Amino acid sequence: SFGRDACSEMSIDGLCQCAPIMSEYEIICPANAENPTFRLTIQPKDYVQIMCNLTDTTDYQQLPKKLRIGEVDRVQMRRCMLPGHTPIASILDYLGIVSPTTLIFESDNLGMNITRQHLDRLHGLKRFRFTTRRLTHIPANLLTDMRNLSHLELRANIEEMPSHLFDDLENLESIEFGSNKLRQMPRGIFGKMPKLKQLNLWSNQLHNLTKHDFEGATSVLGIDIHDNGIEQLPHDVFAHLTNVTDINLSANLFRSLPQGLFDHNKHLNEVRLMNNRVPLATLPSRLFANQPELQILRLRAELQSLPGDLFEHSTQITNISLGDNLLKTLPATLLEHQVNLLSLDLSNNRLTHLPDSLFAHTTNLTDLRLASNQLKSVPDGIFDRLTSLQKIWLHTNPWDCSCPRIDYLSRWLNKNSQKEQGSAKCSGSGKPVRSIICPT
């Protein structure tokens, strides 16, 4: 209903000025003021943004009169007051908005708490976002008849999420409860959502998670619980997440991990455990072992040692980020089964020596970062089976350029001069390692 023609018919009237900005249309109400109560942005057929500057709910009486926006996918309301005891659909009805599948309401000027009524008529919505910096109360009936919701995002300093809020949310696939204050998981919530795949619970207060907190979450593929102040986790905490593919355990406070943490989670593909806020000295035996689909591991930090069993029979591993830890060495059998490994980052780690058999089976390794460590040498033939190698980082290491000690390395680096990123230098002298010539 709105387009190029609808923009021209406004302008000169002096009520609300419509000015085209690139692909969008900017509407200012009242026309010409550095304090407009309504600043609208519209890109026809796609989206509409309403930005309010209200003192009270009676300021909605000065909304643009008539106006036919028509078919729009997304509706975004920023800084707007909830319209007392009336539906939001009425504001949308007054602007002539039909078939909106996405509703975003972001405001620190609510004036009241959200109600089931505020969401009347628009029960066919597929995406809902409610965001505020205000201390709020969420009613258990808010999402009644929201049978079409596929994505739910709530960010309103929520301490406890009502159990009955998840009823009739049978088609939900995504949850985003990041930056709330949740202390506990609402009980029996996943029995209600058999199509849930993404579960974002990051930046909450879920310090005490147990096996029962994810009962019925058998269809879930991704669980993000980063920054939850978790110090400890029972071994069976993810027993019920049998389809889980991605787990984010980052920015937590683990001093240790239990032994069979990923047992029953045999469809894992990526595990992140980055920026641990305290030293996590080591990982338990076979933590990432017998995983037939596991490919990516992002691990940081203050890890001091790893078990030789860590990746046992996880032959599909392709990327391992072990950089910025405190590892002094690695077990010789650590990468025995990583036939499909493509990238290995061990930079900034304090490594003093490497076993000669470490890269014996990583024949698909293309990138190897060993820079910024404490290596004086590498054993003879260590890199010989790296047939697929393309790039290697060996700089910022105190290499001992004594012969015969530096012979294999200097010779190997001359034979593979293109592959070296940066320049590995001799300790003291500062001469490049590949410029040292040992006899015979």
Binding site: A19, I28, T41, Q76, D227, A251, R277
Partner: protein, 68 residues
């Protein structure tokens, strides 16, 4: 500062016309970035006002600065 239907941002800006030249200002300053809870302790992700110079300064962006 509306954005695409399938994109989120670390910092949100508010669009305004000044007299016409379009300006993009930070929704208050200097606030922490959003989706920044998994960065190292040393980093302080803060929303910072960007400027474009004309041959005078124009606020044109709000960006996430990982401050050390």
């Amino acid at each position: 500062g509306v954005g695409g239907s399938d994109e989120r941002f670390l910092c949100r800006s508010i669009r305004k016309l000044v007299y016409a030249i379009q300006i993009e200002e930070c929704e208050g300053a200097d606030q922490p970035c959003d989706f920044a809870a998994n960065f190292p302790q040393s980093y302080n992700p803060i929303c910072k006002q960007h400027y474009t110079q004309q041959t005078f300064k124009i606020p044109s962006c709000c960006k996430c600065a990982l401050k050390t």
